[PDB]
């Protein structure tokens, strides 16, 4: 009989789980196709460096930035890469608009099983952010330790 507060992951509520899974799949596919059409041709290569910066890691970064409405320091310059980028931009426009239409209403749904947003409605976002910061620190420290071991091997 008690009212059910929305979960700690309530920011995913506006879209169905199938939409989220297909979004992840589309992001992976777009990044892979961007890398493919940017780097496969030997005529795009000049030791030898490519004419563009769109490797697989950079392609994933560009696609993630485009979906987050942020942007990076690089942008596709060829016809095929720009086709990929433009269709990804259109997809992002539609999906982000649909998601953010009613996010605040979705975050405060009380289920039977206007007002300001409370911190309990975004505590999950905050938890994910702190976890990401901690994981980034862990990765950086692991890389530093590995490089120190490699330097020790070089000096021995």
């Amino acid at each position: 009989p008690q009212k059910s507060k929305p979960g700690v992951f309530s920011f995913l509520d506006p879209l169905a789980y199938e939409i989220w899974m297909c979004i992840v799949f589309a992001y992976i596919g777009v990044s892979v196709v961007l890398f493919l059409v940017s780097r496969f041709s030997p005529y795009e290569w000049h030791s030898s460096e490519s004419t563009n910066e769109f490797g697989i890691f950079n392609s994933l970064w560009f696609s993630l930035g485009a979906f987050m409405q942020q942007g990076c320091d690089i942008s596709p310059r060829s016809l095929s890469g720009r086709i990929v980028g433009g269709v990804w931009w259109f997809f992002t426009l539609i999906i982000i608009s649909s998601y953010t239409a009613n996010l605040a209403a979705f975050l405060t749904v009380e289920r039977m099983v206007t007002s300001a947003l409370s911190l309990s409605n975004v505590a999950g976002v905050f938890y994910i952010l702190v976890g990401g910061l901690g994981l980034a620190m862990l990765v950086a420290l692991i890389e530093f330790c590995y490089k120190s071991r490699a330097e020790a091997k070089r000096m021995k």
């Binding site: 199938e18 899974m21 297909c22 799949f25 589309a26 992976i28 596919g29 892979v32 196709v33 890398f35 493919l36 780097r39 496969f40 030997p42 290569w45 030791s47 030898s48 697989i56």
Partner: protein, 190 residues
């Protein structure tokens, strides 16, 4: 690292092909209430629905891919979607493209001189992943057209998509490395 990359590409291509074939063949795509006799919990795939638990356990019935009466064809989009879902053209196309990529990988291993075969394999794997995406979207949309869950065949298909994309990336990297080595050797010989 070329041999390790070759082995990883071959293993991943085989894994993705096998997962996609198993997902297409099997019928654990969706868990939902229904009947397998021409409301009980049933598991259904792309072709057949079968009842779990209850009294008619083990009975499999072919999915009626054209439900509802009055056969309204005024909207051609819905009929097109029903035809695409019934044929399962996109999952089978993904299976075929995965097999073609594996065949290209094997032929390149046998030839080891023609670099375009590796590019063809990578293209085939990327296209297989895209076909998997389209098939997943079509299947979910057709189901939309009552608590339910997805079985292990659906997640096998999803993992097949992921592995196919990884193998396509690896094959493109191998093509790039082969052309880079060719250019470096040409520079050295000049």
């Amino acid at each position: 690292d070329r041999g390790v990359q070759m082995l990883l590409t071959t293993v991943g291509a085989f894994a993705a092909f096998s997962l996609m074939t198993i997902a297409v063949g099997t019928d654990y795509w969706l868990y939902s209430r229904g009947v397998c006799k021409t409301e009980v919990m049933t598991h259904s795939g792309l072709w057949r629905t079968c009842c779990l638990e209850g009294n008619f356990k083990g009975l499999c019935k072919q999915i009626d891919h054209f439900p509802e009466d009055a056969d309204y064809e005024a909207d051609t989009a819905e009929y097109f979607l029903r035809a695409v879902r019934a044929s399962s053209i996109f999952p089978i196309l993904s299976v075929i493209l995965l097999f073609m990529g594996g065949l290209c990988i094997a032929a390149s291993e046998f030839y080891k001189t023609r670099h375009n075969i590796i590019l063809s394999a990578g293209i085939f794997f990327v296209s297989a992943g895209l076909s998997n995406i389209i098939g997943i979207i079509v299947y979910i949309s057709a189901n939309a057209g009552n608590s339910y869950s997805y079985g292990w065949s659906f997640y096998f298909g999803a993992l097949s998509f992921i592995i196919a994309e990884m193998v396509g990336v690896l094959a493109v990297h191998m093509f790039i490395d082969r052309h880079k080595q060719l250019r470096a050797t040409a520079r050295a010989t000049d």
